[PDB]
């Protein structure tokens, strides 16, 4: 992925049918003003590890305004232009502190996961507490097949 450039689009039905955000590489302060930011040291979309993404809750378009509404079993769906990835939330929203960096590790202690998988993490960006959710990859399908079930 190229620092500062979009590489995917995210949809989260819980946050609204029309909620759609670009995901850019990196988490520099300027990236987070344009969209969601992928932690550049974490796994790529759909890969083994933990695909971790940050977004603002109360500034710059407030993409994560309604983060507290996320629930276990809620889907987080991304497209890279080739494949649709459906992740499913297992844990959170979990309240923590800005210095708690372990939440984006490949197997985060607080996620409840006890083994390697294909995970996704969302975090809010309070510099107050942050909220975190953790998810695992449930399904993939090609963009030729149309939109995945989560988005119909």
Cα 128 to Cα 56: distance, rounded to the nearest angstrom: 13
| Catalytic annotation present for 56 | yes
Topology of 1-152 in CATH? Sortase; Chain: A; (2.40.260)
Q: Positive or negative CA dihedral for 72, 21, 45, 40? A: negative
Residues near 113 by beta carbon (within 8 Å), at least 6 away in sequence? 90, 107, 119, 134, 136
Technique employed here was: X-ray
Closest alpha carbon to 36 in 21, 46, 48: 21
Determine the Cα–Cα distance for residues 122 and 60; give it in Å rounded to an integer: 17
Which one of the listed residues 72, 125, 129, 136 is annotated catalytic? 125
Other Cβ atoms closer than 10 A to 111: 23
Q: Domain spans of the chain?
A: 1-152
Using alpha carbons, list the distances in angstroms from residue 135 to 32, 52, 70, 91.
21, 10, 11, 7
Q: CA geometry: angle at 41 spanning 57 and 26, to 5°?
A: 45
d(CA 66, CA 85): 22
Q: State the burial class of residue 18 (Cβ atoms within 10 Å of its Cβ: 0-12, 13-18, 19+).
A: exposed
Name the active-site residue from 56, 72, 129, 136: 56
As a whole number of angstroms, the distance between CA 80 and CA 141 comes to: 11
Residues 30 and 56 sit within 8 Å (Cβ to Cβ): no
């Amino acid at each position: 992925y190229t620092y500062g450039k979009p590489f995917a689009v995210m949809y989260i039905p819980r946050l609204g049918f029309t909620w759609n955000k670009p995901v850019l590489e990196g988490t520099g302060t300027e990236v987070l003003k344009k969209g969601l930011g992928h932690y550049a040291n974490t796994a790529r979309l759909g890969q083994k590890g933990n695909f971790a993404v940050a977004g603002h809750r109360r500034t710059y378009g407030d993409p994560f305004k309604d983060f507290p509404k996320l629930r276990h079993g809620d889907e987080v769906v991304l497209t890279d232009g080739t494949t649709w990835f459906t992740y499913v939330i297992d844990t959170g929203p979990y309240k923590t502190v800005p210095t708690d960096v372990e939440v984006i590790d490949p197997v985060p202690r607080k996620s409840g996961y006890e083994r390697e998988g294909r995970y996704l993490t969302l975090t809010t960006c309070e510099p107050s507490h942050r909220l975190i959710v953790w998810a695992h990859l449930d399904s993939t399908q090609p963009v030729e097949a149309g939109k995945p079930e989560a988005l119909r």
